[PDB]
């Protein structure tokens, strides 16, 4: 069959990863040099952490990749016994590698690892660092215990810029010979919200549905991120405007009340314009409405009353 | 083929498996040293309070072959030792997971084993994947063949000379039943063949006893409760006591129950006894209990004497224990209590 | 009897053996019972990836009556745990039980099992459940596209399975190759904590009765071509208990990645069908080639 | 048989042509199956809009009348803990098709009721076995889905019925 | 390949990065612990990650153990002086004939013998799996038994615990 473009066009070399130019350049330097230290790679979903670690391991180990890499993720058994036996035996293995090259243990989604396993990892890292190096990949670097962080170089991946997403989208379009327009690519990038995976999925969906990637065609399938709609609803200077946004853009589109209130809390946490007193009062009202929704009264009237209270506070 | 060895007899396979199992109980990883005359499997615990060593002579194996000069990969395991007579001996040492080797060496409940082969190939014509792997080939009586290749890590070998020093001290101190003279001659020959050389400080005590009585007494000993063993020898009897001291908590509450079980053997029963002129020695029991079960696994009728020899000098000094079989030497060294 | 199906036997060994063979598929799940004039079959499936069917023919029963006319067969579903517990409690005095009778009166009635002793009879009724939409016939060997076939002695295969289980085997690879001069190579290669290990079956007409590679069409024999099947040991090991009583085992692998094991112990016959993994990793392929060459 | 059923079940759409109101989604999914390029899918919407009906109809169209043999359906009524993801879903997604009938389909209905640990374990199962298997996740509450899972799925919104 | 924190690790007690007063207190306590009849049997060091607990303990042991070890009466395992000043517990060790929960129990039962001519400092940094309730209870029992033991002679026992928060896990 035909693979989805998200997996079909997964970068296979470090030079095809867009964004985080400084970090990717440093990874390329490490690959060409060899002296890879223990590292932690943190960042939001779909920005290239897994791809970056895999590409770096491949470039470092060459043909020895099969015998020199041990990959484990949240879908595998990773308990304390695994650390005691499998990882320990891999780190004990004597493998002849070119100078400056070490075995690599990739621990994808390391944040989910249990406390006992993480504590056990300390001793193996202490003992087998001369021949083995650890690459953790996670979304929250703080979920790795401090004794493990103390041994690793930290690398934080930032959200991808519109320029990098556009460049990769153009490369994919050229490879696939896809017909498009500037407004269509703008809409895809705007709906991706910095997630390259979502951008590729939306591009593929639009192409399959209609082929030509225009703004109207993109917005027929893809929806604008509802956090922005919630921000617009909260920032409306008129009660009727907020109510109209809540009705037309969220309620009648099938968005659940619980999702609306959770997104409202998340957005209100990041409103830079408002004062602290107003912000905390809005948070209180959102929390009370959330309590009411959890009890079973998830009605449009409750959300309208929440908006009315927020507007009252703004005055 | 850097090294190759084969075992065919059933009792030989039994003793090999038992030795590997005991060594695995002592430490997670066993150390194998191949020489031009013997294979040494040894183990030492984390606290360095116990050392176990089993040496299989080349005559033990049906086929034996060692070509150290062919080793290319894993060269860090190759060692050269200079003899006192001006000779160079080549050795190859490596470390292997004890549990894995024990599982490989165990006899299937239903199917028997015809031959058991262990080999190492680190020569030039060796694939990269197969480098640093111990090849094990097991032929079954049903013509089934099983193959294993557990990984190993080359290491350096540091011989232990406690046995040689104890033997020399015992010979100097106590060196008439003809058996005693035979023991003296055997010890002198062993010391001479080794690759290396009336104050109270020269205290030495030797006990040769039939291991059957000790094994019978220890069969009732549960190491989980009786963790200490005390040997008390005088000119009339030898007492072996498996014991455990009590522990009292804050308000004298019993945190750990004391226990003791003793067995006495007349000195007449003991094969030999030499004392430095009621000697007492205390050490750990688990390792001794496990070690006493290796020799009997073969059960050789010819020259069959499951006699254990013990040497001890002073509290806090090591206690040495020796057992022998037609082509196997078993050694156990333990640290003794320093009290008094 | 007035029941639509009624079969009585004096050999309690067949029933307990069938339950023992079905146990590895889960102590708490469903079992399908098919009833027809030919006999009575127990069927179990796991994870839409493995299936077992154990047949009990008419001859095994001293009495067998199938009076249904509208339908040539009857299908029902029961819970394995219920039968297991009931038999375990009832079979405590195995020396005294003299007769065992199974009965069924069609859809809407329970599956009745009666243990008849000299003076005491114990009757149990198991409630039945709707049969899942999944079709047992879905997982079957394509008889027209056999990649290879082999006949093996039960004892040797059972010993090999025991060895694989005792080393904590995680992945299994069935390797089958044929050459001239009646040279055959059937082997099981295991990936486990020990690494890669091999168990080779001798090329003798005592344990490996015959081996043939058909080039994926069941007809043309090809020499020098190796057929490799990659399986998860979790599913492969489920045939160990069936092999324990097996007298002969017939392996048949097709091109669609289906392996069928027919176990023969008048007698109890078993058929286990399993799917293989999608593909073999490069490291595993290299290690298998090195082991076999 | 169907006559005794409640109308909510007696009138369940059998083919995609019987699903009304979701014209855009039906159009897109039909073209995807026509080209055979189905990606991982998320169906998000309020109760009774046609999500389960649509996914079942799509499975029927892809695999004809024998879809029950190569589709693994799980819902809130089934335990779907991390152990289930590690064993059952993993083994189904990592095994060949019954008759080499393209890719396999795993339907996770009401996936908003799954635990965070199970969803986290699902990420690499979805990613690694994409060649052979495709996932469909149905939900009414998106806030219960982890960001990683949402990133991996092509999202389709079922609107309230016009 | 070498990591700098290993390449440039301290070679002597003076190069250790530690406040002078804390080092003085630790040294006095440890030196007192080595005396024939020491009041304190266990020294418990606690602190955040990478604050030189184990490093300072090892550097201090390198000086204290040779000064207080009785000269062997011509007895030793190997020809070398057996430079094993520090004996550390290994939490990932698995042996054939021992349940996991008892591993630590075995270790201490050997560690008690390392006195006088076999003197060595016992260091516990890699703890057993204390997240398991039964294992933690057994560990506490063993620590209490060591504290309340009636053995006239015991070696100094140092427990280094690195304190850190456990991130919330699903
Ligand atoms: N910087 C990037 N450049 C090119 N493609 C990218 C990039 N980031 C993501 N992608 C694409 O999206 C797919 C997934 O990328 P990943 O490396 O798995 O993202 P991720 O950050 O690891 O997501 P998580 O943390 O596992 S949810 C890749 O196969 C690429 O096709
Ligand atoms: N688009 C639709 N077209 C025709 N009938 C529908 C449609 N949607 C729902 N129904 C009818 O309502 C019944 C339920 O449809 P479902 O597909 O199960 O709705 P749903 O969106 O899956 O509900 P939830 O999210 O699980 S509460 C169907 O049997 C149909 O009879
Ligand atoms: N001047 C130095 N002082 C202390 N440590 C140094 C120094 N230079 C390099 N290092 C290294 O930094 C590390 C010090 O960390 P530790 O001694 O392990 O602290 P800790 O209190 O034991 O924290 P944990 O429990 O090991 S995470 C050692 O590996 C030292 O080898
Ligand atoms: Mg990732
Ligand atoms: Mg539904
Ligand atoms: Mg430290």
Coordinates of C-alpha atoms in Angstrom, one line a residue, chain A residues 30-291:
Chain A
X30 CA 28.6 15.4 17.9
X31 CA 27.9 13.0 15.1
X32 CA 31.0 14.0 13.2
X33 CA 33.2 14.1 16.3
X34 CA 31.9 11.0 18.3
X35 CA 32.2 12.1 21.9
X36 CA 28.5 11.7 22.7
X37 CA 27.7 12.3 26.4
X38 CA 24.6 11.3 28.3
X39 CA 21.8 13.6 27.0
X40 CA 18.2 14.6 27.7
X41 CA 16.0 15.9 24.9
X42 CA 12.9 17.7 26.0
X43 CA 10.2 19.5 24.0
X44 CA 6.6 19.6 22.8
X45 CA 5.1 16.8 20.6
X46 CA 5.9 16.5 17.0
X47 CA 9.0 18.7 16.7
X48 CA 11.6 16.0 15.9
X49 CA 13.0 14.7 19.2
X50 CA 12.6 11.0 18.3
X51 CA 13.8 11.6 14.7
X52 CA 16.8 13.6 15.9
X53 CA 17.9 10.9 18.4
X54 CA 17.4 8.1 15.8
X55 CA 19.3 10.0 13.1
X56 CA 22.2 10.8 15.5
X57 CA 22.5 7.2 16.6
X58 CA 22.5 6.0 13.0
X59 CA 25.2 8.5 11.9
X60 CA 27.3 7.8 14.9
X61 CA 27.2 4.0 14.7
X62 CA 27.1 3.4 11.0
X63 CA 26.8 -0.3 10.2
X64 CA 27.2 -1.1 13.9
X65 CA 23.8 0.3 14.6
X66 CA 22.1 -3.1 15.0
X67 CA 24.6 -4.3 17.6
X68 CA 25.3 -0.9 19.3
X69 CA 21.8 0.6 19.9
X70 CA 19.3 -0.6 22.6
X71 CA 15.9 1.2 22.1
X72 CA 13.1 1.1 24.7
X73 CA 9.9 3.1 24.9
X74 CA 6.7 3.2 27.0
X75 CA 5.3 0.3 24.9
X76 CA 8.0 -2.1 26.2
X77 CA 8.6 -3.5 29.6
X78 CA 10.9 -1.1 31.4
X79 CA 10.5 -2.1 35.1
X80 CA 13.3 -2.5 37.6
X81 CA 13.9 -6.1 36.5
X82 CA 14.6 -4.8 32.9
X83 CA 17.2 -2.4 34.3
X84 CA 18.7 -5.2 36.4
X85 CA 19.0 -7.7 33.5
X86 CA 18.6 -6.4 29.9
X87 CA 20.1 -2.9 30.1
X88 CA 22.8 -4.2 32.5
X89 CA 23.8 -6.9 30.0
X90 CA 23.7 -4.5 27.1
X91 CA 26.0 -2.1 28.9
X92 CA 28.3 -5.0 29.9
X93 CA 28.7 -6.1 26.3
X94 CA 32.2 -5.6 24.9
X95 CA 31.7 -4.2 21.3
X96 CA 34.6 -3.1 19.2
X97 CA 33.8 0.4 17.8
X98 CA 35.8 3.1 16.0
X99 CA 37.6 5.5 18.3
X100 CA 35.2 8.0 20.0
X101 CA 32.1 5.8 19.4
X102 CA 30.1 4.2 22.2
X103 CA 27.0 2.0 22.5
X104 CA 23.8 4.0 22.8
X105 CA 20.7 3.3 25.0
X106 CA 17.7 5.2 23.7
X107 CA 15.0 5.6 26.3
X108 CA 12.1 7.2 24.5
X109 CA 9.4 8.7 26.7
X110 CA 11.7 8.4 29.7
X111 CA 9.3 10.5 31.7
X112 CA 7.0 7.5 32.2
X113 CA 9.7 5.3 33.7
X114 CA 9.0 4.1 37.3
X115 CA 10.8 5.5 40.3
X116 CA 12.5 2.2 41.1
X117 CA 13.8 1.8 37.6
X118 CA 15.1 5.4 37.5
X119 CA 16.9 4.9 40.8
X120 CA 18.4 1.7 39.6
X121 CA 19.7 3.4 36.4
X122 CA 22.0 5.5 38.6
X123 CA 24.4 2.7 39.3
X124 CA 24.5 1.4 35.7
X125 CA 25.2 4.9 34.5
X126 CA 28.0 5.2 37.0
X127 CA 29.6 1.9 36.1
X128 CA 29.2 1.6 32.3
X129 CA 29.7 5.2 31.2
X130 CA 33.1 4.4 29.6
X131 CA 31.4 2.2 27.0
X132 CA 27.7 3.2 27.0
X133 CA 25.9 6.5 26.7
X134 CA 22.2 7.2 27.5
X135 CA 19.9 9.4 25.4
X136 CA 16.6 10.2 27.1
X137 CA 13.7 11.7 25.2
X138 CA 10.8 13.3 27.0
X139 CA 8.2 16.1 27.0
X140 CA 8.9 17.2 30.6
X141 CA 12.5 17.2 31.5
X142 CA 11.5 17.7 35.2
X143 CA 9.9 14.2 35.3
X144 CA 13.4 12.6 35.2
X145 CA 14.8 12.3 38.7
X146 CA 17.5 14.9 39.6
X147 CA 20.3 12.3 40.2
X148 CA 19.9 11.2 36.5
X149 CA 19.7 14.8 35.2
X150 CA 23.0 15.5 37.0
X151 CA 24.8 13.2 34.6
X152 CA 23.3 14.5 31.3
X153 CA 23.5 17.5 29.0
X154 CA 20.1 19.1 28.6
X155 CA 18.7 20.0 25.2
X156 CA 15.3 21.8 25.0
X157 CA 13.6 21.8 21.6
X158 CA 11.4 24.9 20.9
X159 CA 8.3 25.2 18.8
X160 CA 8.9 25.2 15.1
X161 CA 8.6 28.6 13.3
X162 CA 6.3 29.1 10.4
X163 CA 9.4 29.4 8.1
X164 CA 10.7 25.9 8.9
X165 CA 7.3 24.4 8.6
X166 CA 6.8 26.1 5.3
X167 CA 10.2 24.9 4.1
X168 CA 9.5 21.3 5.0
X169 CA 5.9 21.5 3.5
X170 CA 7.4 22.8 0.2
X171 CA 9.9 20.0 0.1
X172 CA 7.1 17.4 0.6
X173 CA 4.9 19.1 -2.0
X174 CA 7.7 19.1 -4.5
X175 CA 8.4 15.4 -3.8
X176 CA 4.6 14.6 -4.2
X177 CA 3.9 17.2 -7.0
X178 CA 1.0 18.7 -5.1
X179 CA -0.9 21.7 -6.4
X180 CA -1.4 24.5 -3.9
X181 CA -1.8 28.2 -3.2
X182 CA -0.1 30.5 -0.8
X183 CA -3.2 31.0 1.3
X184 CA -3.6 27.2 1.5
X185 CA -0.1 26.8 2.9
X186 CA -0.7 29.7 5.3
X187 CA -3.9 28.0 6.5
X188 CA -2.1 24.7 7.0
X189 CA 0.7 26.3 9.0
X190 CA -1.8 28.3 11.1
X191 CA -3.8 25.2 11.9
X192 CA -0.7 23.2 12.7
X193 CA 0.1 25.5 15.7
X194 CA 3.8 24.6 15.4
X195 CA 3.3 20.8 15.2
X196 CA 4.9 19.4 12.0
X197 CA 3.1 16.1 12.4
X198 CA -0.2 17.8 12.4
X199 CA 0.8 20.0 9.5
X200 CA 1.7 16.9 7.4
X201 CA -1.4 15.1 8.4
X202 CA -3.6 18.1 7.5
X203 CA -1.8 18.5 4.1
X204 CA -2.3 14.9 3.3
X205 CA -6.0 15.0 4.3
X206 CA -6.6 18.1 2.2
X207 CA -4.8 16.6 -0.8
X208 CA -6.8 13.4 -0.6
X209 CA -10.1 15.3 -0.2
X210 CA -9.5 17.7 -3.1
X211 CA -5.9 17.7 -4.3
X212 CA -5.6 21.5 -4.6
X213 CA -4.5 23.0 -1.3
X214 CA -6.4 26.3 -0.9
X215 CA -7.6 28.1 2.1
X216 CA -11.3 27.2 1.7
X217 CA -10.4 23.6 1.0
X218 CA -8.1 23.4 4.0
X219 CA -10.7 25.0 6.3
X220 CA -13.4 22.6 5.1
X221 CA -11.6 19.7 6.8
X222 CA -9.2 21.4 9.3
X223 CA -10.6 23.6 12.1
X224 CA -8.9 26.6 13.6
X225 CA -7.3 25.8 17.0
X226 CA -10.1 26.2 19.5
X227 CA -7.7 27.7 22.1
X228 CA -7.6 30.9 19.9
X229 CA -11.4 30.9 19.7
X230 CA -11.6 30.6 23.5
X231 CA -9.1 33.5 23.8
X232 CA -11.2 35.6 21.5
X233 CA -14.4 34.7 23.5
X234 CA -12.7 35.7 26.8
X235 CA -11.2 38.9 25.4
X236 CA -14.4 40.3 23.9
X237 CA -15.2 43.7 25.2
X238 CA -19.0 43.1 25.0
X239 CA -21.0 40.4 26.7
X240 CA -23.1 39.8 23.6
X241 CA -20.0 39.3 21.5
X242 CA -18.6 36.7 23.9
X243 CA -22.0 34.9 24.0
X244 CA -22.2 35.0 20.1
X245 CA -18.7 33.5 19.9
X246 CA -19.5 30.8 22.4
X247 CA -22.7 29.9 20.5
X248 CA -21.6 30.0 16.9
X249 CA -17.9 29.0 17.1
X250 CA -17.9 26.5 20.0
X251 CA -21.3 25.2 21.1
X252 CA -22.9 24.6 17.7
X253 CA -19.7 23.1 16.3
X254 CA -20.0 20.2 18.8
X255 CA -17.4 21.2 21.4
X256 CA -18.2 19.7 24.8
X257 CA -18.6 22.0 27.8
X258 CA -15.8 20.3 29.8
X259 CA -13.4 20.9 26.9
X260 CA -14.5 24.6 26.7
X261 CA -13.9 25.2 30.4
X262 CA -10.6 23.4 30.6
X263 CA -9.4 25.4 27.5
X264 CA -10.7 28.6 29.1
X265 CA -8.6 27.9 32.3
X266 CA -5.5 27.2 30.2
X267 CA -5.9 30.3 28.1
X268 CA -6.6 32.6 31.1
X269 CA -3.4 31.3 32.7
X270 CA -1.5 32.9 29.8
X271 CA -3.3 36.2 29.3
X272 CA -0.6 38.9 29.4
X273 CA -2.8 41.9 29.0
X274 CA -5.1 41.5 32.0
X275 CA -4.3 42.5 35.6
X276 CA -3.5 39.9 38.3
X277 CA -6.7 40.6 40.3
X278 CA -9.0 40.2 37.3
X279 CA -7.1 37.1 36.2
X280 CA -7.4 35.4 39.5
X281 CA -11.1 36.3 39.8
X282 CA -11.7 34.9 36.3
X283 CA -9.8 31.7 37.3
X284 CA -12.1 31.4 40.4
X285 CA -15.2 31.7 38.2
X286 CA -13.9 29.2 35.7
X287 CA -13.2 26.8 38.5
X288 CA -16.7 27.2 40.0
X289 CA -18.2 26.5 36.5
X290 CA -16.0 23.5 36.1
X291 CA -17.2 22.2 39.5

